[PDB]
Design a protein around this ligand. Structure first.
Ligand SMILES: Nc1ncnc2c1ncn2[C@@H]1O[C@H](COP(=O)(O)OP(=O)(O)O)[C@@H](O)[C@H]1O
Ligand SMILES: Nc1ncnc2c1ncn2[C@@H]1O[C@H](COP(=O)(O)OP(=O)(O)O)[C@@H](O)[C@H]1O
Ligand SMILES: [Mg+2]
Ligand SMILES: [Mg+2]
Lengths: 327, 325
């Protein structure tokens, strides 16, 4: 067959990329893939930043080094930084909006993060995103903002009488109408930031998504959810990383023939372990064929081997990254 | 105008659920406990349920209150209660991430089922602050949206789900897990449909809105009243709590102070001026309350006291003021 190269080298080749998002469900290897992409990009690019919005602090455990809320340089690199991230009328109206429109706080946090990152001045940013479910809401942010605007408008419409009647009483910093206009302005600031950011995100020159999974149903199902959602929102993805593949080198036909020929020559325990490993290989192959049915025409499908050790520490990450970019 | 008491709540012997709402700190818990104490007289069995996040019921009654009906010391028929790989788990987590509030709707569904099977004559609900109670009102919409989401996912990924069902044998069937999630949504929706049908019946359900003579409290009260009206839920009782001497009008003390202020020692002068300023402000907001309501609502004015209304006797005296002024 001829197909895209089964590596992430196309990411390194596209030198114009400014945002690389790494997605997938929990435990498939998002953080490892992100760290390896950062290590590889640090070669050609002037400055590379890794941002983790996954709730835990997995970045520190990955690099075996404490990572701060602001760009922490990585030991062994000069141009690789990492960063991990977790009376008053206006206050009441803002609280009411937060309770009414779930997700507006996430949108404002993401807006603030984008402002801070875009002012940090880096050549490329790799985002270790949260598990798929949370990233899908991240994608829905424009709808969340539109509903928040509609709520504030409905609120003005429905309670203008009370708000105007109260404006005459309370002096100083508690004019209700001014508080409503200020809440509109904060929503407007958030929406403008997110619109500029989304314009950059819909440009395949600057932004692409790497989807990580493992050869099991739930991982591939969440990958398909993410791929379709990204396509819906015009965000480019052309890389699937299938992680933790049980020895991708050898073929199930080959080892099945060997086992059917030579199983009874093995002690019972070795025979049982070989049989279990073969069944696991067959199942994984079923799911990898499913991946190539869904993708492969339009995606670089990278197969990564299951290792005995956790991929922590700089040297391990470098070896894994080399497997990632040229197998 | 309607009588300035909550006696109409006691008179309507058909009431099954009385919800008490309002902003934080306005007196929801106090009013709920007092309504329960008063209802325990006419009704055979009365239950107080607290969905307020904190454990304020225990502090109110000065007694630890349990997760299931705890009888109240001094009462024979008044109980209170305070309230806190895997394909199915993954799909439910996806739904929780997609439809925020579905878990709250299911928790409320289970709570309502348990309450309806405890079989009480009347239940008084001390709700959480207004913002959360409004979402409670939106729960049926959230359930419909969750159903629609699971069906959209079923439609779009049926191919993948069935192809994986063919692979993994025995249990952990993804299609069965999706049908199981639909069935759990259906259970929840049936409970909440019964509950909402009871909520829209003024014979069985009414809302008491608590506020204080301040702008924000009245604003949240108006939000709550309009939301209840949208959803066909009855409210005809406003409790304005912590009123600074509700009997007298600020006019009298204003005339007295403007005449005789400088003849007072410094401390008396200062406290009198502070009290007068607060009373003037409170009177503006109480006039606002009577503008908004009073035509259609029983407006109960309750005095601000020096002590916190904790303990059974405090609750009894406050309840007497609440139902017969
Ligand atoms: N190819 C692999 N083989 C063996 N273990 C791996 C592999 N890739 C990642 N791991 C380990 O699995 C754990 C989960 O990986 P991580 O990148 O944290 O996943 P995620 O970020 O998607 O939750 C990590 O401790 C990592 O060391
Ligand atoms: N009329 C009143 N005078 C003085 N204190 C009061 C009055 N009503 C309530 N309190 C006190 O104010 C506090 C808040 O009341 P609570 O019923 O807990 O409000 P909510 O439940 O709405 O937050 C309680 O400690 C209560 O004892
Ligand atoms: Mg991660
Ligand atoms: Mg309370």
């Amino acid at each position: 067959l001829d197909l895209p190269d089964p590596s992430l080298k196309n990411i390194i080749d596209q030198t114009t990329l400014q945002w690389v998002f790494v997605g997938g469900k929990g435990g498939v290897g998002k953080t490892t893939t992100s760290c390896c992409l950062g290590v590889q990009l640090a070669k050609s690019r002037t400055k590379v930043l890794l941002v983790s919005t996954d709730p835990a602090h997995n970045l520190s455990d990955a690099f075996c080094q404490k990572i701060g809320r602001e760009p922490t340089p990585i030991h062994g690199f000069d141009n690789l930084c990492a960063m991990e991230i977790d009376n008053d009328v206006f206050g009441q109206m803002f609280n009411d909006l937060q309770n009414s429109i779930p997700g507006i706080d996430e949108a404002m946090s993401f807006s603030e993060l984008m402002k801070q990152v875009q002012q940090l001045d880096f050549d490329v940013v790799v985002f270790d995103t949260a598990p798929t479910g949370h990233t899908l809401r991240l994608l829905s942010f424009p709808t969340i903002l539109e509903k928040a605007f509609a709520k504030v408008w409905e609120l003005k419409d429905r309670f203008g009488g009370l708000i105007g009647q109260a404006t005459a009483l309370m002096s100083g910093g508690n004019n209700p109408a001014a508080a409503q206009e200020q809440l509109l302005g904060k929503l407007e600031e958030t929406r403008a930031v997110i619109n500029k950011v989304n314009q950059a995100f819909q440009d395949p020159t600057k932004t692409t998504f790497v989807c990580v999974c493992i050869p099991e149903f739930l991982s591939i199902y969440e990958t398909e959810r993410l791929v379709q959602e990204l396509s819906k929102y015009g965000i480019d993805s052309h890389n699937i990383v299938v992680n933790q593949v049980l020895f991708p080198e050898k073929d199930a036909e080959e080892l099945s023939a060997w086992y059917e020929a030579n199983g009874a020559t093995l002690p019972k325990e070795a025979r049982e372990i070989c049989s279990k490993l073969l069944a696991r290989k067959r199942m994984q192959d079923k799911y990898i064929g499913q991946c190539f049915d869904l993708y492969g025409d339009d995606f670089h499908v990278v197969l990564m081997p299951l290792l005995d050790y956790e991929v922590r520490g700089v040297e391990k990450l470098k070896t894994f990254s080399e497997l990632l970019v040229d197998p």
